[PDB]
Design a protein around this ligand. Structure first.
Ligand SMILES: N[C@@H](Cc1cc(Cl)c(O)c(Cl)c1)C(=O)O
Length: 313
C-alpha cells in the first residue's frame, strides 16, 4: 500500500480525500488528535493512536493534545487530578510506539492570546451549533452548563493554534470538526476513526467495569473480559469481538479447534473471518479464544514497556 491507503485503512471518513492527497505532497505536514485524559487507556484509544502512527510513518509531525481544560469543562474532575492522569496517558501513548509532541489544552488557552481567539470564535458560533456539536460528547446534565458550549470552541481554537494540516478523531468529533472548517481561515483535513463498541455490546467502549480492554490489562483479565463479551453467533454488526479482529489482529490468523468442528482453522483475512462467522461456521467461544490470545500478544510489548518504566529498569 502507498501512504494514502495506509492512512485511509480502517477509517470511517476523510474530509476530503482530495485535500489529503495534496497534503501528502508537502515536505512538512502535521496532524493532531486530542484526548480528555482517561484513567484507563483502552482499545478505543489504541485504535486512534495506531492511526496517528500511520500518519507519523507517512512523514507527519504528530501533536497530541491532552485536553485538560476540555475534560475539566466536561465534568471529569479537578484540574490537577486531570493533568496527572494526562501525564500518565502520555506515557501510555509513548509505550505504544508513538513519536509525538504532547501539549495540555490549558497551555494554549492560558499562556497566549490565543485566549482571546476563544472569544472571537464565540462571536461566530451559534449556541445551537455548539450544543449540537456536543451531542455525542458532553456528559449527562439535566441543567446544561455554559461550560458545554465553550468546549467545542476550545477544540476549534487548539486546531488553529497548532497550525496543523490534519485533525484526527472518532466519528463523535465530526460536528466539532465541521465547525473547525467553517470557523478558521484554513480548512483542516479531517480523518475520523470508527467508534469501537464496548465489550458489553451496549454503546462505545468506555472505562465501565468489564466494558473495555485496557492496553495494560493482564493476560488473565483479557481472557476473562473477552470470554464474557457480547458476541452472538452469526452476528457481526455491533459485535465487539469481530470489531477487535478487524481493527487490531494480523492475518493469516490461526483459530484452534476441534476437529469435530471443521478442525483447525487458518483464516487469511478479516473478510474471510466475517464470512465464516456470518455463516455460523465459527463459534463465538472459538473466536473469543483466538481473539483473546492474539490480543494478549499484541498488547504485551505495551504492557512490558510500561512496567519496564514503572520501575526504572
Ligand atoms: N473532544 C475531544 C477532546 C478534546 C480535544 C481537543 Cl483538541 C480539545 O481542544 C478539547 Cl477542548 C477537547 C474528546 O472527545 O476526547
Amino acid at each position: 500500500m502507498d501512504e494514502f491507503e495506509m492512512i485511509k485503512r480502517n477509517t470511517s471518513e476523510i474530509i476530503s480525500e482530495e485535500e489529503l492527497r495534496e497534503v501528502l505532497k508537502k515536505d512538512e505536514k502535521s496532524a493532531l488528535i486530542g484526548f480528555e485524559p482517561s484513567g484507563k487507556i483502552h482499545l478505543g484509544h489504541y485504535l486512534q493512536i495506531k492511526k496517528m502512527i500511520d500518519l507519523q510513518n507517512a512523514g507527519f509531525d504528530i501533536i497530541i493534545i491532552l485536553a485538560d481544560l476540555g475534560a475539566y469543562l466536561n465534568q471529569k474532575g479537578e484540574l490537577d487530578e486531570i493533568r496527572k492522569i494526562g501525564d500518565y496517558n502520555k506515557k501510555v501513548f509513548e509505550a505504544m510506539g508513538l513519536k509525538a509532541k504532547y501539549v495540555y489544552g490549558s497551555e494554549i488557552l492560558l499562556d497566549k492570546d490565543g485566549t482571546l481567539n476563544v472569544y472571537r470564535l464565540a462571536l461566530k458560533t451559534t449556541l445551537k451549533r455548539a450544543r449540537r456539536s456536543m451531542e455525542l460528547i458532553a456528559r449527562e446534565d439535566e441543567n446544561p452548563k455554559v461550560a458545554e458550549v465553550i468546549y467545542p470552541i476550545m477544540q476549534v481554537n487548539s486546531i488553529h493554534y497548532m497550525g496543523v494540516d490534519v485533525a484526527v478523531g472518532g466519528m463523535e468529533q465530526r460536528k466539532i470538526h465541521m465547525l473547525a472548517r467553517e470557523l478558521l481561515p484554513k480548512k483542516v483535513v479531517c480523518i475520523h476513526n470508527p467508534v469501537l463498541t464496548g465489550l458489553d455490546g451496549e454503546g462505545k467502549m468506555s472505562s465501565s467495569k468489564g466494558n473495555f480492554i485496557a492496553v495494560d490489562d493482564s493476560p488473565e483479565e483479557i481472557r476473562a473480559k473477552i470470554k464474557k463479551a457480547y458476541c452472538p453467533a452469526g452476528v457481526v454488526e455491533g459485535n465487539p469481538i469481530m470489531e477487535i479482529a478487524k481493527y487490531f489482529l494480523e492475518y493469516p490468523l490461526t483459530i484452534k479447534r476441534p476437529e469435530k468442528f471443521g478442525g483447525d482453522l487458518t483464516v487469511n483475512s478479516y473478510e474471510e473471518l466475517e464470512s465464516l462467522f456470518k455463516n455460523k461456521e465459527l463459534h463465538p467461544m472459538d473466536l473469543k479464544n483466538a481473539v483473546a490470545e492474539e490480543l494478549i500478544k499484541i498488547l504485551e510489548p505495551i504492557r512490558k514497556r510500561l512496567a519496564h518504566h514503572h520501575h526504572h529498569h
